[PDB]
């Protein structure tokens, strides 16, 4: 399971250095950007939080919430982003889908109870995660490393707007190439 | 078995979709795994070949995927190719080949519709590193054509993030080639 990732993180992210740390944001960004071609997303927002966390938001389809375990718990324990869950102290996931907001938490990768919130016509996903400082040699995301990836992803997804906000210093950049 | 069947049943959960961007997840993964060995395994060169038949070959001079017996009673390379990021590539490929230089020897393994062959010990060598070849399954992907410029953009990023690493790209479909290098 996720125990395997914690035991041998190098098998999943190459190392536990700064390049290993950046695998986490690369995965969560990738998953959001995937919704431009797969889910009619128009905007992805990436925030580098001053406490070391990361938030990635999109207006794609929303991770499926239908069930007897919710699909989001399967995603967050089985697929690419489960490595992020394994190596984070906590994650928060917000989904807009099927007419409602939905909220889930992971505490050392253990799911909370999926909560149905307010009605909404919006669709998309917000993923927030806090990399475990007991795993990583470095918990500082590099603005220019992240910017280079988001520029590539905007260029490969004509019409997608990607916003990067560094909450550590207020630095922000928007990436957009028209179709 | 089970875990790879899951990828074939719901590929969008692993690679987003089954179009051009989904196809490129496979090369991004295998390239990433090789480039990881620059920071982790003293690699100096990665070579990416877009094969004329649609396959991909990625070579590195890193440590070599471990070949010794895993706790699960198979060679560690078989665990890697069935359990971790590259197992998605295995699941969605008709076949894979893996050449490893490690522990004083050359080693060769195949995967046929993700099923491991018998790991074979080859000649002695002092070299270390890995070659991974894969052939994306046209029954999965709506296109099997890799985009040279898309691949070149990723390799330039990876060379910039790994000062001193040489990355060579060869398109065997038309002879186009690029070499990426940023000095330390
Ligand atoms: C981290 O989750 C990622 C997503 O990330 C974001 N940010 O959306 C995204 O990269 C991708 O999102 C998908 C990937 C596949 C489908 C997908 O296949 C859908 N189609 C359905 O009819 C559907 C509805 C419910 C359900 O449980 C499943 C899962 C089964 C599949 C994929 C056949 C599929 C669908 O509505 O949304 C999908 C979505 C939102 O894959 C995830 C879920 C692992
Ligand atoms: C697809 O394989 C990738 C590798 O890709 C390439 N091209 O080398 C690379 O990205 C990374 O390679 C690692 C990842 C971890 C270790 C690693 O932890 C080593 N340390 C050991 O002493 C060791 C020795 C035996 C052994 O079974 C393991 C753990 C198993 C692993 C890493 C698969 C570790 C080691 O020598 O090499 C390692 C190597 C080469 O992770 C893989 C295996 C998923
Ligand atoms: Zn990696
Ligand atoms: Zn560095
Ligand atoms: Zn549609
Ligand atoms: Zn993806
Ligand atoms: Zn070393
Ligand atoms: Zn060495």
Residue numbers in the entry:
A (entry chain B): 22 to 88, 92 to 102, 123 to 213, 245 to 254
B (entry chain A): 20 to 102, 123 to 213, 245 to 254
Q: Can you provide the manuscript's text about this entry?
A:
Gyrase is a type II topoisomerase and the only enzyme that can catalyse the introduction of negative supercoils into DNA;3,5 it is composed of two subunits, GyrA and GyrB, which form an A2B2 complex in the active enzyme. Gyrase is an essential enzyme in bacteria and has been extensively studied as a target for antibacterial agents;6 gyrase has been described as an effective drug target for the development of new anti-TB agents. Other compounds, such as the aminocoumarins (e.g. novobiocin), inhibit gyrase through targeting the ATPase domains of gyrase and topo IV, located in the N-terminal domain of GyrB (and ParE), thus preventing supercoiling. In addition, we present crystal structures of the GyrB N-terminal ATPase sub-domain from Mycobacterium thermoresistibile bound to one of these compounds (Redx03863) and also to novobiocin, demonstrating that this novel compound class inhibits via a binding pocket and resistance mechanism different from that of novobiocin.
